[PDB]
Design a protein around this ligand. Structure first.
Ligand code: J51
Length: 223
């Protein structure tokens, strides 16, 4: 479980910042609203890896939701092709993502899903697919995403989205949420003496997924 941990009690992360009063206060507050946490490896891929695992876990046993999601994933090669990615170059990454969606449908266990996300090869193929889809979605809707002036959208996607180990910001989160119709909530724990606070992507929605963002790193929360 080197990439995505077993579920732990929320207060188990107090030990990561001992005697730091603001982190202690915010984790204590968070523990009133969430019961458990899964840790992710900090390798610059943790947003994509956490979102991928948590969203697919939330689908286990939900036959209609799985069927609708599989219908969208089957269309995603057209998004990639429209943005100028070539099929022979994304095929191996698309096939890895489609395989793990079929595992959710046909196998349906937390233990099998956790095994795929902790297999370095399968998990990294999944992350790379999600990065190319994020890039395609931004490229194909450049008029909308210019808002997140001096930098080309194309150059942003080439440098800060497509390469493995490049960190996320609001733009990548909004884009992948829109590209796969995944509603998620991010809880922010920074070192300032401020209120524990969150954002929902998109604004109106009931979240499937809760993430904790802290020391530029994304972990999974359970309500
Ligand atoms: C999302 C992810 O994988 N994050 C990560 O690796 O963050 C580690 C880190 C901590 C402090 C500064 C830079 C990076």
């Amino acid at each position: 479980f080197n990439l995505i941990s077993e579920k732990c009690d929320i207060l188990s992360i107090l030990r990561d910042h001992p005697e730091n009063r603001i982190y202690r206060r915010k984790i204590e507050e968070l523990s009133k609203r969430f019961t458990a946490i899964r840790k992710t490896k900090g390798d610059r891929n943790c947003f994509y890896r956490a979102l991928g695992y948590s969203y697919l876990e939330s689908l286990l046993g939900k036959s209609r939701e799985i069927f609708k999601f599989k219908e969208r994933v089957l269309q995603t090669p057209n998004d990639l092709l429209a943005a100028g990615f070539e099929e022979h170059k994304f095929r191996n990454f698309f096939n890895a993502f489609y395989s793990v969606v079929e595992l959710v449908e046909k196998d349906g266990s937390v233990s099998s899903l956790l095994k795929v996300f902790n297999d370095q090869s399968a998990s990294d193929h999944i992350v790379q697919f999600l990065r190319l889809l994020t890039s395609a979605f931004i490229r194909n809707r450049a008029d909308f995403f210019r808002h997140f002036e001096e930098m080309d959208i194309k150059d942003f996607c080439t440098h800060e989205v497509e390469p493995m180990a490049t960190e996320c910001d609001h733009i990548q989160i909004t884009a992948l949420s829109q590209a796969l119709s995944i509603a998620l909530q991010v809880e922010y724990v920074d070192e300032m003496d401020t209120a524990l606070n969150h954002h929902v992507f998109p604004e109106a929605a009931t979240p499937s997924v809760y993430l904790l963002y802290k020391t530029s790193h994304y972990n999974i929360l359970y309500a």
